[PDB]
Design a protein around this nucleic acid. Structure first.
Ligand SMILES: Nc1ncnc2c1ncn2CCN[C@H](CP(=O)(O)O)C(=O)O
Ligand SMILES: [Mn+2]
Lengths: 555, 411
DNA sequence: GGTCGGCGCCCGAACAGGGACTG
DNA sequence: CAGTCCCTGTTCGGGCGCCG
C-alpha cells in the first residue's frame, strides 16, 4: 500500500481495553450487492485490505442510500470500537451562519469527492477496524477486510479530517491572506475582493494545491454562478435565505411528528420571524411513548396554522456590513415567549430568533427580558464577534428602578427605549419605609408535618384578627396563606410583618407570574393595592404581635 | 538547554476538559498575533485532535495598559496538580508583607518563557483559539515552556528566582518580596518617592537576566467594616423590630448579644410607625451591644489548611460589603467598597472590580485566593465577566441567591 | 437505515443544597 | 442536636432539526 501525502494522526485505544469482537448483522441481498460493489472498488484504490485469521477482531457493517444519487454510502457500526477508543477533542466549535459573511466581489463553492476516503488512518490502529462482509450464502466464510482510511462511522474520523484539512489550507492561506476561506468539513466557501479575472486564477491555484495532497475538486460540484448553495442556504450577491422547509401534514399526529414539526419550526425561526412553539411543545410534556398518537389541542391547531401562513411568504436575510452598527430588537410575544430580530438597516433582517425558557417557579418580565438579552448577546458574539445595540420594550426608568434595588447583580448593554407594546413594567412596588396611617398586620403560619393541617392568620393594631383552618398544606404554604389573608382583609395601604424568610424572599423579587396558584393570588392582590410595606422578625422571640399570632396558629 | 523539572498529575485524575467559550473580535485578533509570535519564538507549537485535554483562553488589558495580555483559565488544571506546588516546592508567605506602607505588583510572567516545560506534561496545557462565525475549525496549540497562569510555574522557577533576587535582597534586607503566580509583590516602608525608585532598580535588575509593570498598594491603609447600630433619638416600633432582627442575626457571631429587654418594648400589637419610648433597662442593652460589636470575635484565627471563602453583598448606591471567613460566623476580615468603576451604571463591572480588590487583599494577607459566593445569576456572570477582568489570576467562585434578610453589614 | 461529530430546542428525571421543625 | 422534607435550582440523558 502506497504512502498518503497527508500526515497521519496517532490514535490509541483507551489503556486496558482490546479491539471489538462482535458478530455481524444479517444483511438484505440488495445491500450485499451494493456493499461488495463498493468493497471491491475501494480495495483497488488502496482504501481497504483483506485480513487473515491473525486479526481476531470484528465489527458490524451496513449501508444506506445516498441522497439524490444511485450510489450507496458505506457505514460501520463502531459502537463497540468507539467505547474503547481514546477520547478526542473536537475542533468544530459551532456552525457558521450566512449573516456573518461580508460582501465579497467574487464567490466560489466546491465540495470534494469522498472526503473521509482521501485522508489516511493511523497504521497501528487498522487492526481494530476488522469487519466481515456476509456473502449471499450463510455458509460462505465471508471476506474479512480492514480499513485503511477514516471509516465513515468512527468517532474520530470527522475530528481528524477537519484538522488535516486546515493544515493543508495553511500554506495556501499564508500565501493568500486576503482570500476568505470558510472551512466546514469538505465544503469550501471561497470569497475575494479581487477582480473576477484573478479570481478563477486563485481558484485553480487552490484546486491544484488541494490536488497535490489527494483532494479532488470535481467540476461537477464546482459552483461559479450565483445563486450558490451553501450550508442549506441560497447566497445571492445581495441577499440570502434558507433552502425551502417542508412540514408534515399528517391527519393523525403522533409524538414523533410533533418533534419533526417542532424541530423544523426552530430551524425556520432564524429568518422567518414570529414563530411560536409554546402550545405545540405543550403536547410533548409528560408523554409516555414516541409513536403514541396525540390529538391536536385547539390552541395547538391555531399555532400551527399561523406558522404555515408565515412560511408561505418569502423572507430573506442580508449580509454583515462592518461599517454600520449592529442592532437587535425584542418583543413580548406571549406569556413566557419572546422573539427578536437582528439587523443593520431597518426591515433588512440579518437573522431572527426566539427565547422562551422558563427559569424558576417565580419570575417577572424584567427577569425574562434579561435572560433573553444574554441569549442574544452570546449568539451574536458567536456569529459577528460583537455585542449588538439593543432596542427594548422597557422604559428607561422602569429598568433603572429594577436593577438598582434588586439584590442580585444584573446589567444590560448599551440599549435604547422603543415604544412597542406590550411594554415590560413592574406591576407593583414594595415601599421602603412603613406607611403612616396603615393598619399593621402581624402574620404567621404553622402546620403539622404529619397531619398536613395548619392555621394561618393575623393580629392588627386596630384589634382585627382572623385564623383559618387549612388542609393538605405545608409550613411554607401556610406562611404565604397568612399573607394572602392579610392582603384580602386590608385597605389600600397595609403594613405586613412576618417571621417567614421563605415568603419575604419570593415577594421582594417582584414576581408577576408563578407556577404556584397561591403566589398568583398573592400577586393579584398586590397590584390592586397602592402602598405595601413588608418586614421580617425572628419568631419565638416575643415580638409585638408576632408571638400572639404564633400562639393562635400554633396548632 | 535547561533540564525540565518532572511533574505529574495528582493520583487518579485526568487532565482538564473544559470547552472554549466564544470570544469577541478584538480578543481573537490579539490572540492570533501573540500566538503567531510565540510560535515563532518556540514558546508554543500547534497540535491535533488526538489530545483529549483543553483549557479556555482569552485576552485582557491591565489597568491603564494598552498592550493585550494573553490569559489562560488554568483553574481546572491547578485543581488537578495541587500536590506539586504545596508539598514539594512550596513558597513561604511573609507575614510582614501586609504591614508595609506601600506594596507594588509587577508582571513578571515574561521570564517563565525562558525555562522549558516537562515533555510528559505538555499534553495538559492544550488550548484552542476560536474563529468568528466559526470560519475555520479550532486553531490549537500547546505550551513548550513554563505557561503564564499555572501554579507550577512559580514553583519550578523559584530556584532561579531566588538567585536573581539575592543580589537585591542582600543590598536591601529590609524589603519584603513575595512571588504569587505571574506577579511579584514588593513591600517596603520607604517613602512613596524612594519606594518607586527601588522598583526601577529591580526592573533593571530583572531586565539583565531576561524579563515590566507597576501597580501601587497601601496595605496599612486597609480598614475593616464593623457592624454598626443606628444612633437615633426617636425610635418607632419598626425601628426596634429591625434592630432586634439585626441584633439577633449578629448574636451568632458575638455570643454575648441579648435582645431580652428590647423584646419587652414590643409587647403590645402596636402600629409600626408608632413611636415607642426606650425604657431604662433597654437603653443599657443598646449601649452594651454597641461595645461588643467593637470587640473582635473570640476564637477567630486563620488556618493554613482550610480554604478561604468570601461573600459579597450588593448594598445599592455603589456600596458593596464583603466578608472573608474559613468557618461560618468566624470572619477573618470584613470591609466595604465604594464608588468603584461602573458605579451607578454597571453592576457586573463593579462586582468584577470587587472580586479583584478582594482577591488582591487575600494574596497580601494570607497568600491564598478565596472561593467566591457571588450575588449574581450564573448566566449573567459567565457572559460579561471577561469584559472587565484586569488581573493575571482567576479565583474560583459559585453563585448564590439569598434575598435581603435584615441589613447586617451596611446601615 | 438504525455510523460518527458539531450546534440548536424542549422535556423529565436525577442530583443538591439551604431552611424550618423535631427526637 | 442530627434527622427529616419542603422548596427551588441545576445538571444530564434523549428525542427531533440542521450541516458534512
Ligand atoms: N449520514 C452520514 N453519515 C456519515 N458520514 C457522512 C454522512 N453524510 C455525510 N457524511 C460525510 C461526507 N460524505 C460524502 C460522501 P458519502 O455521502 O457517500 O459518505 C463525502 O465524503 O464527501
Ligand atoms: Mn463531499
Amino acid at each position: 500500500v502506497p504512502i498518503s501525502p497527508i500526515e497521519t494522526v496517532p490514535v490509541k485505544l483507551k489503556p486496558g481495553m482490546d479491539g471489538p469482537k462482535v458478530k455481524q448483522w444479517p444483511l438484505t441481498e440488495e445491500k450485499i450487492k451494493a456493499l461488495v460493489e463498493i468493497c471491491t472498488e475501494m480495495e483497488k484504490e488502496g482504501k481497504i485490505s483483506k485480513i487473515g485469521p491473525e486479526n481476531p477482531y470484528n465489527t458490524p457493517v451496513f449501508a444506506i442510500k445516498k441522497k439524490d444519487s444511485t450510489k450507496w454510502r458505506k457505514l460501520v457500526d463502531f459502537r463497540e470500537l468507539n467505547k474503547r477508543t481514546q477520547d478526542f477533542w473536537e475542533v468544530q466549535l459551532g456552525i457558521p451562519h450566512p449573516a456573518g459573511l461580508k460582501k465579497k466581489k467574487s464567490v466560489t463553492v466546491l465540495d470534494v469527492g469522498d472526503a473521509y476516503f482521501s485522508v489516511p488512518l493511523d497504521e497501528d490502529f487498522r487492526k481494530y477496524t476488522a469487519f466481515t462482509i456476509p456473502s449471499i450464502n450463510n455458509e460462505t466464510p465471508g471476506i474479512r477486510y480492514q480499513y485503511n482510511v477514516l471509516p465513515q462511522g468512527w468517532k474520530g474520523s470527522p475530528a481528524i479530517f477537519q484538522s488535516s484539512m486546515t493544515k493543508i489550507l495553511e500554506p495556501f492561506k499564508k500565501q493568500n491572506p486576503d482570500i476568505v476561506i470558510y472551512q466546514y468539513m469538505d465544503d469550501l466557501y471561497v470569497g475575494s475582493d479581487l477582480e473576477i479575472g484573478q479570481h478563477r486564477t486563485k481558484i485553480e491555484e487552490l484546486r491544484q494545491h488541494l490536488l497535490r495532497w489527494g483532494l479532488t475538486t470535481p467540476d461537477k460540484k464546482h459552483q461559479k454562478e450565483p445563486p450558490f448553495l451553501w450550508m442549506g442556504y441560497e447566497l445571492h450577491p445581495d441577499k440570502w435565505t434558507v433552502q425551502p422547509i417542508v412540514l408534515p401534514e399528517k391527519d393523525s399526529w403522533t409524538v414523533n411528528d410533533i418533534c419533526k414539526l417542532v424541530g423544523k419550526l426552530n430551524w425556520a425561526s432564524q429568518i422567518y420571524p414570529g414563530i411560536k412553539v409554546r402550545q405545540l411543545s405543550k403536547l410533548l410534556r409528560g408523554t409516555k411513548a414516541l409513536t403514541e398518537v396525540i390529538p391536536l389541542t385547539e390552541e395547538a391547531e391555531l399555532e400551527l396554522a399561523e406558522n404555515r401562513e408565515i412560511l408561505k411568504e418569502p423572507v430573506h436575510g442580508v449580509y454583515y456590513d462592518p461599517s454600520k452598527d449592529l442592532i437587535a430588537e425584542i418583543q413580548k410575544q406571549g406569556q413566557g415567549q419572546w422573539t427578536y430580530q437582528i439587523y443593520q438597516e431597518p426591515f433588512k433582517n440579518l437573522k431572527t430568533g426566539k427565547y422562551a425558557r422558563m427559569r424558576g417557579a417565580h419570575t417577572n418580565d424584567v427577569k425574562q427580558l434579561t435572560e433573553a438579552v444574554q441569549k442574544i448577546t452570546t449568539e451574536s458574539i458567536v456569529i459577528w464577534g460583537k455585542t449588538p445595540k439593543f432596542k427594548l420594550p422597557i422604559q428607561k426608568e422602569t429598568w433603572e428602578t429594577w436593577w438598582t434595588e434588586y439584590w442580585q447583580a444584573t446589567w444590560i448593554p448599551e440599549w435604547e427605549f422603543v415604544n412597542t407594546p406590550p411594554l415590560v413594567k413592574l406591576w407593583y412596588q414594595l415601599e421602603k419605609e412603613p406607611i403612616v396611617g396603615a393598619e399593621t398586620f402581624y402574620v404567621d403560619g404553622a402546620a403539622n408535618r404529619e397531619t398536613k393541617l395548619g392555621k394561618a392568620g393575623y393580629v392588627t393594631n386596630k384589634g382585627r384578627q382572623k385564623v383559618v383552618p387549612l388542609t393538605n398544606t405545608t409550613n411554607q404554604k401556610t406562611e404565604l396563606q397568612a399573607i394572602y389573608l392579610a392582603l384580602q382583609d386590608s385597605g389600600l395601604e397595609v403594613n405586613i410583618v412576618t417571621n417567614s424568610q421563605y415568603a419575604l424572599g419570593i415577594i421582594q423579587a417582584q414576581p408577576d407570574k408563578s407556577e404556584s396558584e397561591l403566589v398568583n393570588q398573592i400577586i393579584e392582590q398586590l397590584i390592586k393595592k397602592e402602598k405595601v410595606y413588608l418586614a421580617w422578625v425572628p419568631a419565638h422571640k416575643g415580638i409585638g404581635g408576632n408571638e400572639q399570632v404564633d400562639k393562635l396558629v400554633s396548632a | 538547554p535547561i533540564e525540565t523539572v518532572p511533574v505529574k498529575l495528582k493520583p487518579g485524575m485526568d487532565g482538564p476538559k473544559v470547552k472554549q467559550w466564544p470570544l469577541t473580535e478584538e480578543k481573537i485578533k490579539a490572540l492570533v498575533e501573540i500566538c503567531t509570535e510565540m510560535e515563532k519564538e518556540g514558546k508554543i507549537s500547534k497540535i491535533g485532535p488526538e489530545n483529549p485535554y483543553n483549557t479556555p483562553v482569552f485576552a485582557i488589558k491591565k489597568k491603564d495598559s494598552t498592550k493585550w495580555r494573553k490569559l489562560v483559565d488554568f483553574r481546572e488544571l491547578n485543581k488537578r496538580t495541587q500536590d506539586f506546588w504545596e508539598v514539594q516546592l512550596g513558597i513561604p508567605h511573609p507575614a510582614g508583607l501586609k504591614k508595609k506602607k506601600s506594596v507594588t505588583v509587577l508582571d513578571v510572567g515574561d521570564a517563565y518563557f525562558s525555562v522549558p516545560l516537562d515533555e510528559d506534561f505538555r499534553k495538559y496545557t492544550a488550548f484552542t483559539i476560536p474563529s468568528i462565525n466559526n470560519e475555520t475549525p479550532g486553531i490549537r496549540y500547546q505550551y513548550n515552556v513554563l505557561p503564564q497562569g499555572w501554579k507550577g510555574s512559580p514553583a519550578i522557577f523559584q530556584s532561579s528566582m531566588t538567585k536573581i533576587l539575592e543580589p537585591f535582597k542582600k543590598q536591601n534586607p529590609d524589603i519584603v518580596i513575595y512571588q504569587y503566580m505571574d506577579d511579584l509583590y514588593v513591600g517596603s516602608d520607604l517613602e512613596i518617592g524612594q519606594h518607586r525608585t527601588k522598583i526601577e532598580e529591580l526592573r533593571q535588575h530583572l531586565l539583565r537576566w531576561g524579563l515590566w509593570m507597576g501597580y501601587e498598594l497601601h496595605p496599612d491603609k486597609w480598614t475593616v467594616q464593623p457592624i454598626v447600630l443606628p444612633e437615633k433619638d426617636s425610635w418607632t416600633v419598626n425601628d426596634i423590630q429591625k434592630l432586634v432582627g439585626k441584633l439577633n442575626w449578629a448574636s451568632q457571631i458575638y455570643p454575648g448579644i441579648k435582645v431580652r429587654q428590647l423584646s419587652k418594648l414590643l409587647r403590645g400589637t402596636k402600629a409600626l410607625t408608632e413611636v415607642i419610648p426606650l425604657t431604662e433597662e433597654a437603653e443599657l442593652e443598646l449601649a452594651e451591644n454597641r461595645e461588643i460589636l467593637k470587640e473582635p470575635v473570640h476564637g477567630v484565627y486563620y488556618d493554613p489548611s482550610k480554604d478561604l471563602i468570601a461573600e459579597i453583598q450588593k448594598q445599592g448606591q455603589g456600596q458593596w460589603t464583603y466578608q472573608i471567613y474559613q468557618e461560618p460566623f468566624k470572619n477573618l476580615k470584613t470591609g466595604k467598597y465604594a464608588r468603584m468603576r461602573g458605579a451607578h451604571t454597571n453592576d457586573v463591572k463593579q462586582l468584577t472590580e470587587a472580586v479583584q480588590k478582594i482577591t488582591t487583599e487575600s494574596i497580601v494577607i494570607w497568600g491564598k485566593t478565596p472561593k467566591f459566593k457571588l450575588p449574581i445569576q450564573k448566566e449573567t456572570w459567565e457572559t460579561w465577566w471577561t469584559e472587565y477582568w484586569q488581573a493575571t489570576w482567576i479565583p474560583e467562585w459559585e453563585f448564590v441567591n439569598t434575598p435581603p434578610l435584615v441589613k447586617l453589614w451596611y446601615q
